mmCIF file of C-alpha atoms in Angstrom:
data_model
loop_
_atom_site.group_PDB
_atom_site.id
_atom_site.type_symbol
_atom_site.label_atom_id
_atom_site.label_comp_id
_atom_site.label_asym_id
_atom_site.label_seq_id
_atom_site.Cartn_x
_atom_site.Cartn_y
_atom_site.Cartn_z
ATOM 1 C CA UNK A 2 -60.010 -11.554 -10.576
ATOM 2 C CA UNK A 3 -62.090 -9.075 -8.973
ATOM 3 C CA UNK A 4 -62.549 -4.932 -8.150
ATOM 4 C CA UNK A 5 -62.892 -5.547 -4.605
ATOM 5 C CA UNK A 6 -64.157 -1.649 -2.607
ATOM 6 C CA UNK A 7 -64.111 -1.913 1.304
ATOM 7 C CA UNK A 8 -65.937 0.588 3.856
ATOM 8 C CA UNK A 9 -66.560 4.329 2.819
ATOM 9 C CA UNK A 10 -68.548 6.847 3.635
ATOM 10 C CA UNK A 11 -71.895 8.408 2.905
ATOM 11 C CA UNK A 12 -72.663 10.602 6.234
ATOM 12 C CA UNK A 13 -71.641 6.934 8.112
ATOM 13 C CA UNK A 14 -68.492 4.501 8.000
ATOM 14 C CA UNK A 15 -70.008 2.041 5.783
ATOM 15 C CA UNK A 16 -68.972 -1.618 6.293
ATOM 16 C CA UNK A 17 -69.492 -2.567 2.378
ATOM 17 C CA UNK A 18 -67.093 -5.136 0.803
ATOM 18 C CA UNK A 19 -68.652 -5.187 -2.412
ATOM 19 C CA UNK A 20 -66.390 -6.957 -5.576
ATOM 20 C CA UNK A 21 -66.772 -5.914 -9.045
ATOM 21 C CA UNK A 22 -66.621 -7.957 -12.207
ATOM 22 C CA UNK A 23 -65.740 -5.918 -15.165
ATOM 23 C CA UNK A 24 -66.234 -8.617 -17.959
ATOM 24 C CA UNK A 25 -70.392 -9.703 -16.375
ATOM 25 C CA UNK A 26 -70.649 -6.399 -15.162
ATOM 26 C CA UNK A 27 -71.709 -7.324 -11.818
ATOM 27 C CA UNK A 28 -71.512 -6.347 -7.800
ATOM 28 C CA UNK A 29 -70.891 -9.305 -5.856
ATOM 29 C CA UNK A 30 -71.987 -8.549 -1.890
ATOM 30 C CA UNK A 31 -69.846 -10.145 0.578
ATOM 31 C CA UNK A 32 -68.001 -10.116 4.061
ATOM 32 C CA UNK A 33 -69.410 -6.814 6.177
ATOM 33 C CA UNK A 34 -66.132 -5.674 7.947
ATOM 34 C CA UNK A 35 -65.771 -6.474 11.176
ATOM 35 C CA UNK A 36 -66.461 -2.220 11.877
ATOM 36 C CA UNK A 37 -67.845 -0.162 9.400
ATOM 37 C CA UNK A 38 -64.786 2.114 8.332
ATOM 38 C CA UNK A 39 -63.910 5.720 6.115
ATOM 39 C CA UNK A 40 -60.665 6.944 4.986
ATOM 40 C CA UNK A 41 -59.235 3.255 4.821
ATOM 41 C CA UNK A 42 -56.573 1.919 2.515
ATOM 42 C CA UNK A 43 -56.979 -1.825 0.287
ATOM 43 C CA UNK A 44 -54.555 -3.954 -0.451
ATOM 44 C CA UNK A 45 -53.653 -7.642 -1.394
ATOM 45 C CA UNK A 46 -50.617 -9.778 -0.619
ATOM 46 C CA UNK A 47 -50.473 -13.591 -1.271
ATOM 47 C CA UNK A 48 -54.211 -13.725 -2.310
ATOM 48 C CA UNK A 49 -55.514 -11.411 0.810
ATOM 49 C CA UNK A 50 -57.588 -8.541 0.762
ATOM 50 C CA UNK A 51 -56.043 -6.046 3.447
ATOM 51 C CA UNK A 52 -58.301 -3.085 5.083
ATOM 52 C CA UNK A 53 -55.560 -0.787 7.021
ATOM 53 C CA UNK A 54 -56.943 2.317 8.891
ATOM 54 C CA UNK A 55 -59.244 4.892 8.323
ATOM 55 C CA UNK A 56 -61.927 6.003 10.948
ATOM 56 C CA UNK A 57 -65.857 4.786 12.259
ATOM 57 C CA UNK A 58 -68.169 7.861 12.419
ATOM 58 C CA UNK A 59 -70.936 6.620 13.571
ATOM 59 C CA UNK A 60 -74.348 7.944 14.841
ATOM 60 C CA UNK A 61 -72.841 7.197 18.245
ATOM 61 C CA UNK A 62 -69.004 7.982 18.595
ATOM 62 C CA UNK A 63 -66.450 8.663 16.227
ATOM 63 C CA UNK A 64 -63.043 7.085 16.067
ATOM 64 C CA UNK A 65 -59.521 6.883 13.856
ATOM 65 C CA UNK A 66 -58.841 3.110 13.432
ATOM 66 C CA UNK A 67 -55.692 1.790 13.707
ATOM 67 C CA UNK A 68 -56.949 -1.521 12.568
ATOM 68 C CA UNK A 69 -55.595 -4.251 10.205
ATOM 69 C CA UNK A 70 -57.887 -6.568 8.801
ATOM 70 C CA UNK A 71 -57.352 -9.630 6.064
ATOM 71 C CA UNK A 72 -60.037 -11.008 3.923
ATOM 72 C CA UNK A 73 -59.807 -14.528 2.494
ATOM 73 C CA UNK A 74 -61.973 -14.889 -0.976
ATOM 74 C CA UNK A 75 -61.279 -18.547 -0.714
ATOM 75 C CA UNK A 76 -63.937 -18.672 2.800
ATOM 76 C CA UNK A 77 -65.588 -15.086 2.695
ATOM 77 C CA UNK A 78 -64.223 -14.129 6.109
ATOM 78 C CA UNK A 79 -62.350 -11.674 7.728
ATOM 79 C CA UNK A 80 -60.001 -11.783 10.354
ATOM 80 C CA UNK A 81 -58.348 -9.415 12.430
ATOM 81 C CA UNK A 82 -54.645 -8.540 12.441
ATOM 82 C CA UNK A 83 -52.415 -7.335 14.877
ATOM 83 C CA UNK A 84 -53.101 -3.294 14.772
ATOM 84 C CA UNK A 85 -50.397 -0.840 13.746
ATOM 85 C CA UNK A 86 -48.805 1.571 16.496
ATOM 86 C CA UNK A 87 -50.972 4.591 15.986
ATOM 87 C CA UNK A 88 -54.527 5.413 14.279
ATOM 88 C CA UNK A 89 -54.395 6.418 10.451
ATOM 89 C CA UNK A 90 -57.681 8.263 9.270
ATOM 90 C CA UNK A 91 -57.021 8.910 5.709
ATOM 91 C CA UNK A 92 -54.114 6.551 5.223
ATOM 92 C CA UNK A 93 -52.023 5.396 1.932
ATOM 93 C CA UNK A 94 -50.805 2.173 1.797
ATOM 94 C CA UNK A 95 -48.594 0.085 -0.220
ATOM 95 C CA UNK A 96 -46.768 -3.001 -0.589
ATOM 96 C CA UNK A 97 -43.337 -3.935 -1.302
ATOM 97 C CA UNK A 98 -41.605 -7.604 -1.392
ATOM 98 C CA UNK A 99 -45.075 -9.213 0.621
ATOM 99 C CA UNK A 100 -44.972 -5.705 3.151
ATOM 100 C CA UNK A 101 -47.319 -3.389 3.704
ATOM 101 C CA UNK A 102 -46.295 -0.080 4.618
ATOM 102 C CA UNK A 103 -48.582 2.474 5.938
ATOM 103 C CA UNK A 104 -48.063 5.982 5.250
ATOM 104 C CA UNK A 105 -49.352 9.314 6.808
ATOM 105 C CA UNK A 106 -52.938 9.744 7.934
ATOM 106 C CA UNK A 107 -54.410 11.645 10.607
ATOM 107 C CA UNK A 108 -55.242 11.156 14.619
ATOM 108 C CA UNK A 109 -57.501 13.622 16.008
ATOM 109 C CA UNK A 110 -55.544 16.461 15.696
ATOM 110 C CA UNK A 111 -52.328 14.327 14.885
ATOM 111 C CA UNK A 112 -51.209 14.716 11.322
ATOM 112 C CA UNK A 113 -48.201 12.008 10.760
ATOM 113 C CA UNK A 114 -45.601 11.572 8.949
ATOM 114 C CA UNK A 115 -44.360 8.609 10.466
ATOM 115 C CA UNK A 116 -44.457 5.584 8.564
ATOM 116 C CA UNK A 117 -44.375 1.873 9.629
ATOM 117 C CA UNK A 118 -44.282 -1.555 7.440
ATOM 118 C CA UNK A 119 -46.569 -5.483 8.455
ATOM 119 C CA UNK A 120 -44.576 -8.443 7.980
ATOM 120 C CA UNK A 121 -47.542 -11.209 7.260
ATOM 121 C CA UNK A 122 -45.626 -13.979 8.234
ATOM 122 C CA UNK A 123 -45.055 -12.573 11.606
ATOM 123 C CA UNK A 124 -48.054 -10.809 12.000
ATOM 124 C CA UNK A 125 -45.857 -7.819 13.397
ATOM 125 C CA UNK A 126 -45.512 -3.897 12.223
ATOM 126 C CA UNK A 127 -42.266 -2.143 12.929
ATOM 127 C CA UNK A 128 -42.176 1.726 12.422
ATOM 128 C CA UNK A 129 -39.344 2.750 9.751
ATOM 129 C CA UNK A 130 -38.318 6.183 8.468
ATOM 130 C CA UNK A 131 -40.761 8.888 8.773
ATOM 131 C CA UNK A 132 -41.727 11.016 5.832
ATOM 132 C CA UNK A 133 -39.745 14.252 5.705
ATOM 133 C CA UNK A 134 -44.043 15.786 5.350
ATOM 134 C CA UNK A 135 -47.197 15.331 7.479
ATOM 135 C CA UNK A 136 -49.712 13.806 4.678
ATOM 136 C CA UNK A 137 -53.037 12.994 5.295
ATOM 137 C CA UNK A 138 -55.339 11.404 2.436
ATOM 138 C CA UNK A 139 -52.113 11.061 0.802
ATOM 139 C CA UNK A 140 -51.713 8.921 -2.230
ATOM 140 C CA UNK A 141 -49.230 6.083 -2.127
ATOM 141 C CA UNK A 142 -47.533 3.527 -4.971
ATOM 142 C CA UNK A 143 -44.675 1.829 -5.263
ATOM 143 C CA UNK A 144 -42.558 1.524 -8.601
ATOM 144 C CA UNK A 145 -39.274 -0.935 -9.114
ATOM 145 C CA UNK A 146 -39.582 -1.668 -5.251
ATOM 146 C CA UNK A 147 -39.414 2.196 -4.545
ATOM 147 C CA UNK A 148 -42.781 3.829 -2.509
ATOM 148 C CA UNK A 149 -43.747 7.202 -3.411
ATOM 149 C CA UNK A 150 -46.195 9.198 -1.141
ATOM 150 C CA UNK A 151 -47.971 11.971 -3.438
ATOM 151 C CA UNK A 152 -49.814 15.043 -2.320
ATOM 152 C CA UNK A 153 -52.010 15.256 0.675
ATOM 153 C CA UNK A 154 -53.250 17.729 3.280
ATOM 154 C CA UNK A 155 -49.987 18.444 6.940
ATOM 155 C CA UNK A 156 -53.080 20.051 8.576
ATOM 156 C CA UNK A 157 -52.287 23.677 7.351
ATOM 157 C CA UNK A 158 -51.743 23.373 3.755
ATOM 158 C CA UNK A 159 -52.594 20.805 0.813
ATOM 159 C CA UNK A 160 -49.606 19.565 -1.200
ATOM 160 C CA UNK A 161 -48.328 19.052 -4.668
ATOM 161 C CA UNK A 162 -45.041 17.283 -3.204
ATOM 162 C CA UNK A 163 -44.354 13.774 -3.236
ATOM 163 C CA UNK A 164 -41.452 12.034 -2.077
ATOM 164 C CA UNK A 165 -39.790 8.567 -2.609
ATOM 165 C CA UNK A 166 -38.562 5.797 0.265
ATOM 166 C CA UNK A 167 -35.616 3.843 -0.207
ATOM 167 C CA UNK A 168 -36.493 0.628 1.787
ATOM 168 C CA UNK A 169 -33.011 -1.055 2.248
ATOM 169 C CA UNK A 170 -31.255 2.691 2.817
ATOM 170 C CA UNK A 171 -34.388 3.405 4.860
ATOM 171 C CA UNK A 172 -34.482 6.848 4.379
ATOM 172 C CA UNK A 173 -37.292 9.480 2.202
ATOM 173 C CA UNK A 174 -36.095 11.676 -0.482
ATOM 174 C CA UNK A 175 -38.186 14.709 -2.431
ATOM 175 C CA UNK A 176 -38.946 14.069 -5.702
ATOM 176 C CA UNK A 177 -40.446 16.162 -8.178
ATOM 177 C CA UNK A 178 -43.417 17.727 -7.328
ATOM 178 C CA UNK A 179 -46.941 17.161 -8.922
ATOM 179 C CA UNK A 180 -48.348 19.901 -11.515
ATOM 180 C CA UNK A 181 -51.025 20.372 -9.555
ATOM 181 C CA UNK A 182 -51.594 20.161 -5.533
ATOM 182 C CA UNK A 183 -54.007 17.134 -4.329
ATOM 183 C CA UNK A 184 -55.441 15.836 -1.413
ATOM 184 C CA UNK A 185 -57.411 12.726 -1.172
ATOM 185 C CA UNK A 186 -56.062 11.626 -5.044
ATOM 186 C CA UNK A 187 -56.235 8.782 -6.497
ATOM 187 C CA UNK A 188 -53.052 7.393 -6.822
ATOM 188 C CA UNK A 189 -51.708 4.269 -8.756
ATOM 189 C CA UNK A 190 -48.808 2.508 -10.741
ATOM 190 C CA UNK A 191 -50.036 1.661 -14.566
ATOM 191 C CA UNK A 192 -47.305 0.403 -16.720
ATOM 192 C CA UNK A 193 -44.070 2.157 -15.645
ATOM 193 C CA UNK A 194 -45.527 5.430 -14.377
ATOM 194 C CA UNK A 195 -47.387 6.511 -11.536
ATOM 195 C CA UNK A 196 -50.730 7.852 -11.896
ATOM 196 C CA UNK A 197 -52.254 10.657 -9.696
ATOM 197 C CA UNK A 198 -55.910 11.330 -10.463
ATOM 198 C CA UNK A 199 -58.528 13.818 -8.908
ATOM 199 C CA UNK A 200 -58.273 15.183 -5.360
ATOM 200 C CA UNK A 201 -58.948 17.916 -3.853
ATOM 201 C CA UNK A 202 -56.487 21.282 -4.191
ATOM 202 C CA UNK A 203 -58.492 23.055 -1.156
ATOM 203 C CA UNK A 204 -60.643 25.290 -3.403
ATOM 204 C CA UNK A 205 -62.119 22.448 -5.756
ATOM 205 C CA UNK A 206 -62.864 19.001 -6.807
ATOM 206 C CA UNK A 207 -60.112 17.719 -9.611
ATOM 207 C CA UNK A 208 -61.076 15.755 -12.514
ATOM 208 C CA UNK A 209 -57.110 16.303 -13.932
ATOM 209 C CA UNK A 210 -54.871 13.355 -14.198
ATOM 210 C CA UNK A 211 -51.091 13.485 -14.102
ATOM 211 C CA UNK A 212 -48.640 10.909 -14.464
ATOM 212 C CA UNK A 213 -44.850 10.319 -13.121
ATOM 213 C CA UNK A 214 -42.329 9.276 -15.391
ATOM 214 C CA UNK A 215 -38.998 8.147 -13.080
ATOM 215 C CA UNK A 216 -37.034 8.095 -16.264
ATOM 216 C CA UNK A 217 -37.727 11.963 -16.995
ATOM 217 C CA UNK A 218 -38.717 12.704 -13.034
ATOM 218 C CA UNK A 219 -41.564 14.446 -14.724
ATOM 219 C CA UNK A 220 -45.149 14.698 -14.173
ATOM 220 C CA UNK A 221 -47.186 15.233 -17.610
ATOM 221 C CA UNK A 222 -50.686 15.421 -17.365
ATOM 222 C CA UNK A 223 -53.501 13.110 -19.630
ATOM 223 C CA UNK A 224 -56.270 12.903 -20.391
ATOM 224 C CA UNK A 225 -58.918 13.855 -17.232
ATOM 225 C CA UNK A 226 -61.499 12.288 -15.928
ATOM 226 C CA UNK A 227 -65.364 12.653 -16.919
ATOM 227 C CA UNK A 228 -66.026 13.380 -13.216
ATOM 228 C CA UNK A 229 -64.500 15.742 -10.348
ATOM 229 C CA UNK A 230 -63.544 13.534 -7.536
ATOM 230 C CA UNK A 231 -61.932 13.773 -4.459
ATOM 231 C CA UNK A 232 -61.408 10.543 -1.980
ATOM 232 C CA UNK A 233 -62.375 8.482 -4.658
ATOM 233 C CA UNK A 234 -60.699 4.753 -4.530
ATOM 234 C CA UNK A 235 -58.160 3.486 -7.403
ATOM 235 C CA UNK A 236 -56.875 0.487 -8.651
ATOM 236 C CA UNK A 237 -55.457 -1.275 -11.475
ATOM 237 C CA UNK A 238 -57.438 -4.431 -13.467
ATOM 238 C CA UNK A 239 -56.472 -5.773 -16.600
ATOM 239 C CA UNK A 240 -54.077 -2.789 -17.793
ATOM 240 C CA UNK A 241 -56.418 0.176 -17.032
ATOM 241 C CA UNK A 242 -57.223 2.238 -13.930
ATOM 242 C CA UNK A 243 -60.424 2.047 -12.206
ATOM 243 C CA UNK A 244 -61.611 5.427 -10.227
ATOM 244 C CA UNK A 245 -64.468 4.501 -7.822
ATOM 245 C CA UNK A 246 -67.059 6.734 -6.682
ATOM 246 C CA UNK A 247 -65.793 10.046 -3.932
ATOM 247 C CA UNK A 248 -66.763 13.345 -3.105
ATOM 248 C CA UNK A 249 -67.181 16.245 -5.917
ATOM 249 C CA UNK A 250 -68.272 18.955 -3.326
ATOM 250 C CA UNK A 251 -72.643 18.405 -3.544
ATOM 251 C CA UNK A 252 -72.493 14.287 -3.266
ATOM 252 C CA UNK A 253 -71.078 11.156 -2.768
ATOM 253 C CA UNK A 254 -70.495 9.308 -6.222
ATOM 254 C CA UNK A 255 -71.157 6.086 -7.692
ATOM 255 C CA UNK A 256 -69.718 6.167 -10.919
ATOM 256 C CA UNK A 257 -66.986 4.211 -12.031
ATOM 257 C CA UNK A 258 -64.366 5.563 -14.771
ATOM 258 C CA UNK A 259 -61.783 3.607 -16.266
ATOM 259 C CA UNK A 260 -58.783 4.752 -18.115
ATOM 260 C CA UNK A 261 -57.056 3.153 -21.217
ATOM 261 C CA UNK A 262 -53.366 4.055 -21.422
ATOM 262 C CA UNK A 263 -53.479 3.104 -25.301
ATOM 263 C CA UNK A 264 -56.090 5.989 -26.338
ATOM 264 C CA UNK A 265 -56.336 8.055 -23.243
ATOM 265 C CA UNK A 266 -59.648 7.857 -22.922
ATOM 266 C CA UNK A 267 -61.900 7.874 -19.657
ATOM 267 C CA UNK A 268 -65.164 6.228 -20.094
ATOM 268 C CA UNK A 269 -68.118 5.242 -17.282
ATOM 269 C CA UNK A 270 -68.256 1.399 -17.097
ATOM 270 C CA UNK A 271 -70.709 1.201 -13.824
ATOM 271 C CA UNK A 272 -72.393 2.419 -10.576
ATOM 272 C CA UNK A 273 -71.856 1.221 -7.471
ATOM 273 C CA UNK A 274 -74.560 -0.318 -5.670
ATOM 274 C CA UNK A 275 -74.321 3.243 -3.443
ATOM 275 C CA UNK A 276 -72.209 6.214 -3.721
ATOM 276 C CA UNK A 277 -69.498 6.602 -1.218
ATOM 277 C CA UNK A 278 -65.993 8.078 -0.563
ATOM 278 C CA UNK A 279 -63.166 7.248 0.928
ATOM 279 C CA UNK A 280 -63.049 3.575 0.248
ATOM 280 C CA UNK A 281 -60.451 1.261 0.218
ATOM 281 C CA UNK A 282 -59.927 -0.605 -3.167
ATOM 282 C CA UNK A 283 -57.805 -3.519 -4.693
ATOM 283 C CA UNK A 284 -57.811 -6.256 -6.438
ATOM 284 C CA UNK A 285 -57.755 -10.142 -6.004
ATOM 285 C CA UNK A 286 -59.190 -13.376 -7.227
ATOM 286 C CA UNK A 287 -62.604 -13.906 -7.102
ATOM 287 C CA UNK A 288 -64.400 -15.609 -4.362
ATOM 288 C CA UNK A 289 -65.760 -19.558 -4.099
ATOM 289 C CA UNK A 290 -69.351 -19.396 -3.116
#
């Protein structure tokens, strides 16, 4: 299995899918998407790589994406989905029971907190509960079937709040709120606890890490990161977190950092082939030829 990073952003929505091997150490270059895309969200259901929002800035026009797109390692192609209702710039995604649900995101000047979940087999989204916030680059996981949206920017004010939705009651609840406010985060399930790294807390670049037990409703912080980051991507390989490349205020990273929960310990295991932000990051198996 593979580190797969989609799109970005380095002064240009970068149509990248590049797929990282942590054992050879190598960047596999694959599939351009279909539009080159910022702010996206990654993710994987059955064995497909999904790219969900995020925005094209481009020399010539600029425009939020409402797009879906599903890449198949097994032919190196991607295909189009059916789009969800509204454009997400900055979007958080995740996935419960084979559905995606998108969270949050921006639209111009449209900051939502609506919400809406893709059925794959149907090829159909359907809005649900909205978020009881406005989030953009919010930070989205999902623990025991529960999805948690963490942090993020309503347009006036950045957030340390993060609430939880109940898909069968269908309905968001507060939780706990983060030690520290975060927009554009890093956030991730490792283990039993969800993991909220960098961000941005409207005055600086965060290299802190914080993590959300649900048996305590606590967040306690560990160890940080070697590197200030904010829209960085995130994912989970091989029991450890992967941070990849974002924004620490003078330039677009392309370190990689990647945590072990048994010493809590951050170390630099690779570049990117570029730096870039806002990419969209998960993981699946690797590709034929």
């Amino acid at each position: 299995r593979l580190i797969y990073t989609a799109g970005g952003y380095f002064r240009q929505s970068l149509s990248y899918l590049e797929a990282y091997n942590p054992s050879d150490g190598t960047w596999l270059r694959l599939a351009d998407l279909q539009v080159p895309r910022s702010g996206l969200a990654g993710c994987v259901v059955g064995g497909l790589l999904y790219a969900v929002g995020g925005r094209n800035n481009s020399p010539d026009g600029n425009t939020d994406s409402s797009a879906l797109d599903c890449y198949n390692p097994m032919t190196n192609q991607w295909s189009p989905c059916a789009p969800m209702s509204v454009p997400r710039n900055r979007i958080g995604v995740g996935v419960i029971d084979g559905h995606i649900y998108a969270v949050g995101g921006s639209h111009g000047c449209i900051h939502h907190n609506s919400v809406e979940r893709y059925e794959p087999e149907r090829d159909e989204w359907h809005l649900v509960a909205p978020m009881l916030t406005r989030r953009i680059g919010v930070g989205v996981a999902v623990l025991n079937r529960l999805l948690y949206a963490v942090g993020g920017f309503d347009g006036t004010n950045r957030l340390n709040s993060a609430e939880c939705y109940y898909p069968e009651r269908n309905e968001w609840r507060m939780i706990t709120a983060m030690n520290t406010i975060r927009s554009g985060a890093g956030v991730c399930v490792l283990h039993n606890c969800i993991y909220a790294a960098g961000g941005y807390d409207g005055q600086d670049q965060l290299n802190s890490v914080e993590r959300y037990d649900v048996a305590t409703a606590t967040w306690t912080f560990v160890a940080p990161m070697k590197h200030r980051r904010s829209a960085l991507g995130i994912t989970v390989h091989q029991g450890r977190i992967y941070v990849l490349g974002g924004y620490d205020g003078h330039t677009f990273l392309d370190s990689v950092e990647c945590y072990d929960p048994d010493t809590d310990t951050w170390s630099e295991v690779t570049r990117m082939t570029s730096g870039r932000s806002g990419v969209g990051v998960a993981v699946t198996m690797e590709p034929s030829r």
